[PDB]
Amino acid sequence: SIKTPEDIEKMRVAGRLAAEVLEMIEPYVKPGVSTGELDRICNDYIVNEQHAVSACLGYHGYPKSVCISINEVVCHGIPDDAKLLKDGDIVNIDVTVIKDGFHGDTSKMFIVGKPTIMGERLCRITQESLYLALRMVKPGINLREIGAAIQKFVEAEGFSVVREYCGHGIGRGFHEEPQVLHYDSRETNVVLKPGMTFTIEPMVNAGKKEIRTMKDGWTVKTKDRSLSAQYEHTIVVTDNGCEILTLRKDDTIPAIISHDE
Ligand SMILES: CCCC[C@H](N)P(=O)(O)O
Ligand SMILES: [Mn+2]
Ligand code: NA
């Protein structure tokens, strides 16, 4: 699907709101706070101030407003009032907002209190694998190349790439074509074109790539219980590159990546 300039403008707004949620929640990610409380703050902010709504709530039955994953949890962790954060924890908060009918999906890592050396390294490499993919996006490039580039980098830095979950198209629909794998697959063959909008959300494990899903049907963990990190951005392919729709002040990459001279 190719988004019109109208659709794209609406996605800038939605993406911006999703990013502002992460920028707002940051000071609250402290030792002692529960993930259930972090979820309420995000939701109250999304509904009461941004006047938008979470796309996560109700999606295939998802019970909360944002996904919060800690340490070995790979993704889709469910906020809970009894789960408290502690020093060393690495935490991902994934936000998806719907505004004016369009989605904005983004997530970032937060390290609680005193960081662990490997925890910091894992988050750093994960974010760079996303940045690397983002600087690649431009018409002509194949999604298979993007996934191969992410995997090559991640593996060269001593980590692994989760295969089961991937990025995805997005717009009026939460998940739309195409699938955005973060590794090289023979299944992938998609030449990017301007107007396409999708997400890139690499999940990187400190240990092995294998994962497992808990009985709740949502919580995904690393099979070997090693740490897992993830960063995600929503973008739109431009005539000569791409525009990040969910950029935050702490991002060290500009919103528009143009390959023009
Ligand atoms: C609550 C459903 C999870 C939706 C996540 N944003 P993704 O599908 O990008 O992991
Ligand atoms: Mn996503
Ligand atoms: Na994790």
Swiss-Prot record:
Pfam family, one: Peptidase_M24
Keyword check for Metal-binding: yes
Disulfide bridge map: none
Domain of life: Bacteria
Effect recorded for H76A: Reduces activity 100000-fold for the Co(2+)-complexed enzyme, but only 2.6-fold for the Mn(2+)-complexed enzyme
An individual GO BP term: proteolysis
Binding site for a divalent metal cation 2: D105, H168, E201, E232
Annotated catalysed reactions: Release of N-terminal amino acids, preferentially methionine, from peptides and arylamides
Listed name of the protein: Methionine aminopeptidase
UniProt-recorded Gene Ontology molecular function terms: ferrous iron binding; initiator methionyl aminopeptidase activity; metalloaminopeptidase activity
GO (cellular component) term, any one: cytosol
Cofactor(s) named in the record: Co(2+); Zn(2+); Mn(2+); Fe(2+)
Assembly with partners or alone: Monomer.
Function: Removes the N-terminal methionine from nascent proteins. The N-terminal methionine is often cleaved when the second residue in the primary sequence is small and uncharged (Met-Ala-, Cys, Gly, Pro, Ser, Thr, or Val). Requires deformylation of the N(alpha)-formylated initiator methionine before it can be hydrolyzed.
Gene for this chain: map
